[PDB]
Amino acid sequence: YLVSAMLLEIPYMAAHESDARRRMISKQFHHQLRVGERQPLLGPPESMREHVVAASKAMKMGDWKTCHSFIINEKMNGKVWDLFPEADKVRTMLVRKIQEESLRTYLFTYSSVYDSISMETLSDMFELDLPTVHSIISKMIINEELMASLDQPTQTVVMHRTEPTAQQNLALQLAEKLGSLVENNE
Amino acid sequence: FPGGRVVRLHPVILASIVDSYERRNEGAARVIGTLLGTVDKHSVEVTNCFSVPHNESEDEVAVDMEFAKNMYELHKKVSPNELILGWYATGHDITEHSVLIHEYYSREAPNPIHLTVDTSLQNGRMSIKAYVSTSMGVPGRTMGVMFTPLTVKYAYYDTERIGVDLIMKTCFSPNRVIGLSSDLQQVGGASARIQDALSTVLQYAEDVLSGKVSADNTVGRFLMSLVNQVPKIVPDDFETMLNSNINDLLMVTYLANLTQSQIALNEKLVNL
Amino acid sequence: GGSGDSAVKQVQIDGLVVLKIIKHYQEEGQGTEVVQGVLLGLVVEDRLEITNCFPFPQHTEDDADFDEVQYQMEMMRSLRHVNIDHLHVGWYQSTYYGSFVTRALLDSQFSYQHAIEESVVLIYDPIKTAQGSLSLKAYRLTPKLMEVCKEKDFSPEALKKANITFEHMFEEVPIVIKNSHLINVLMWELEKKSAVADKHELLSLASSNHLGKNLQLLMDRVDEMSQDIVKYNTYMRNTSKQQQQKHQYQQRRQQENMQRQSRGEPPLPEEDLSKLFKPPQPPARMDSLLIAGQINTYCQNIKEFTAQNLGKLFMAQALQEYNN
């Protein structure tokens, strides 16, 4: 959920040739291919209904359903560290939900705020000034920076330009195939 | 309120009129059928029809109502759109034989809805006058009927009547479809020049004295309605936008032609 | 003009024939295998001009199941009563697909044209063609198909007929050229609706204003046609690698299986040599997948010719009209 529903919600908008073929989709095709769901009861849906909001980031909504009724059902009690594994989890919920609007909701976002982003989700400014810096180099995102002002101008334009590149998801898988045709021929 | 106001058919009623009339089984003068459609209880919205066996003359007429039920059986199966609302004949209106086919359809006996197609050398008279028959008390003779007019409306699938618009282009001179959109540019040109020749006489009539009466704030209202949608006011950043779209659209069809070549290089290396 | 090979003719679609199609245009069946019916006319002056044709109404809500043929012959006896015979000169369809020829009905209409050489199959699609040339096309399963038969069989009798090499798309016949004189009455309605009753003619003129307002005429079409490319053309290339995984790749070490034992023993068998060369399930090109293969990679060609006339004449009208 933190190495798949985050690492791979970047290339899932029409760039499929990095899909790791052993993940939650073991079970994510199951507890989604059901005609009825509500407030989850099992482990996996109670490990999903905060994941589904970890797509609509909601730092509030996702942190509030790994600590709902698990401290009886072995999350907090059992992991023999009384409260701290949540202080770990909460942090990897707080932080891994600032790395989301960055990767998902950036379309009309040109001028954005990175002081108020610290006020929204309550992580340390340096522990947000690090990953907001990481967001550019580590994930090669189309967004510019002058971080004496603590800002990230985007100038992304890819939206109906990645559609003709979503034609190159397959226009490559035409002319990437002619590379493989005459390997067999001779 | 009276139900006899309007029939909103469309030219597919005239389709199963004319093909049926011009094959006819040599039913020389009078081809007739039973019309099937819907009603708005004021309007009569109709989709289709069919020509039946008849031998209408003085004083013999036949409408095989067993066969009209057979055709309705096949028609309701074809599409569930329609009920047999009455009968449509070719020429002409109120006859003593119409009222014989009335009592044949008062075996059927919904609201009598008739559609009389004049077969004459005219223009001013309509090629169809749709009729309903009220009063309609009638426990007497054959059927006391009173032919009240249904206005002839073509109100269905607009792209169908675009199909009919092409049929009316073929009515003038066909007009085969290979370069449809290619020579719809010639159609769009002819339209834009009729607008020009319209606007010119409107101006030059008042340039002398007393012209552009029915144009000033109607054609002038719909001259600023031209520039509402084309052109965009005067943005040269919109020139840049659509010459950048030209870059996009050329490059869509550009690799379309790279796939065109690749069609042959893929499936015809098969032929070695 | 539109004469075919040894028997078959052009089709003349009169203006009330397209109306017999556009009465069931797309109503009851959006993404369904709509068989818009059987076109019946007669062998007339070089072009079998259509009389009538009614849509053969399969179990029409979700799926497509061919009806009782009681309807077929009883309806076309219903026609026999005051009209022409069931002179079924083919079958016709819509079918929410501009620029295709289907696999199952390809086989069905080949077998139709096998019974009667003098037959064509009309495909009228509405402005879903993308406007978008050639809405009506009367395709026929070709006379090369007709010669080498039956029929285009897959594992054998595929390359064994692609040796002479059947033509696949040939004589997509012309449709509507002449004043058929089923017109003078339509001209008599045309003049009436061009005259004082000019509400409905202008309704259709105005109707095309909103087919470009909100519709993705290009975007949704080039999307579905591009996903037809990624699926069809690329699995076609996997078929190209897999028929190579068999004819030469596997065959190469079938040869090294034959040769490494000095091609058998003098005094005895020659068990291993005869046992080996176990021919892979493709021994000759798998050229019936690849038939519709070519025809559906050319469906992409006439779909990219669609995409051509979409972008070219739209941006033609932009750069010619706007400059004000």
Q: What is the 3-state secondary structure (H, E, C) of chain B?
A: CCCCCEEEECCHHHHHHHHHHCCCCCCCCCCEECCEECCCCCEEEEEECCEECCCCECCECCCCHHHHHHHHHHHHHHCCCCEECCCEEECCCCCCCHHHHHHHHCCCCCCCEEEEECCCCCCCCCCCEEEEEECCCCCCCCCCCEEEEEEEEECCCHHHHHHHHHHHHHHHCCCCCCCHHHHHHHHHHHHHHHHHHHHHHHHHHHHHCCCCCCCCCCCCCCCCCHHHHCCCCCCHHHHHHHHHHHHHHHHHHHHHHHHHHHHHHHHCCCCC
Give the tokens for residue A89.
């989890």
Which residues, 6 or more positions from C237, have their beta carbon under 8 angstroms from its beta carbon?
A: A174, A177, A180, A181, B266
Q: Do A171 and B258 make contact, defined as CB atoms within 8 angstroms?
A: yes
Which of C229, C230, C297 would you mutate first to test chain A, the one with the most A CBs within 10 A? Answer: C230
Q: What is the resolution of this structure in A?
A: 3.4
Q: How far apart are CA B5 and CA B148, in angstroms?
A: 8
Q: Is C97:C139 a contact under the CB 8 Å cutoff? A: no
Point out the residue among B70, B80, B166 whose CB comes nearest to the CB of C78.
B70
Pick the closest to residue C32 from C66, C65, C63, C58 (CA basis).
C63
Q: Do A171 and C229 make contact, defined as CB atoms within 8 angstroms?
A: yes
Q: How far apart are CA A23 and CA A26, in angstroms?
A: 6
Which of A17, A161, A184 would you mutate first to test chain C, the one with the most C CBs within 10 A? Answer: A184
Q: Is C87:C42 a contact under the CB 8 Å cutoff? A: yes
Q: How far apart are CA B83 and CA B86, in angstroms?
A: 9
H helix intervals, C48-170: 69-82, 104-115, 143-147
Beta bridge partners of C40: C52, C88
Contacts of A185 in chain B (CB under 8 A): 269
Q: B123 vs B18, B256, C2, C193, C234, CA distance in Å?
A: 18, 51, 36, 11, 60
Point out the residue among A163, A170, A184 whose CB comes nearest to the CB of C234.
A170
Q: Is C37:C71 a contact under the CB 8 Å cutoff? A: no
Residues in chain A: 186
- Among all chains, which residue has been given the structure tokens 């003349």? C12
Which of A161, A163, A165, A167 would you mutate first to test chain B, the one with the most B CBs within 10 A? Answer: A167
Q: Nearest CA to CA, how far is B260 from chain A (Å)?
A: 11
CB contact, 8 Å: C22 with chain B?
Answer: yes
Beta strands in chain C (DSSP E): 92-93, 121-124, 136-139
Q: Do A167 and B255 make contact, defined as CB atoms within 8 angstroms?
A: yes
Point out the residue among C223, C233, C241 whose CB comes nearest to the CB of A180.
C241
Q: A109 vs A139, A147, A153, B1, C159, CA distance in Å?
A: 18, 18, 9, 60, 57
Point out the residue among A167, A177, A184 whose CB comes nearest to the CB of C234.
A177
**Searching chain C, which residue's CA lies closest to the CA of residue A181?**
C241
Q: How far apart are CA C312 and CA C320, in angstroms?
A: 12
Q: How far apart are CA C286 and CA C152, in angstroms?
A: 11
Pick the closest to residue B249 from C305, A172, C315, A157 (CA basis).
C315
What are all long-range contacts of A57-62, with beta carbons under 8 Å and residues at least 24 apart? A57/A97, A57/A100, A57/A101, A57/A104, A58/A97, A59/A93, A59/A94, A59/A97, A59/A120, A59/A121, A59/A122, A62/A93, A62/A97
Q: C52 vs B128, C14, C34, C83, CA distance in Å?
A: 21, 10, 18, 9
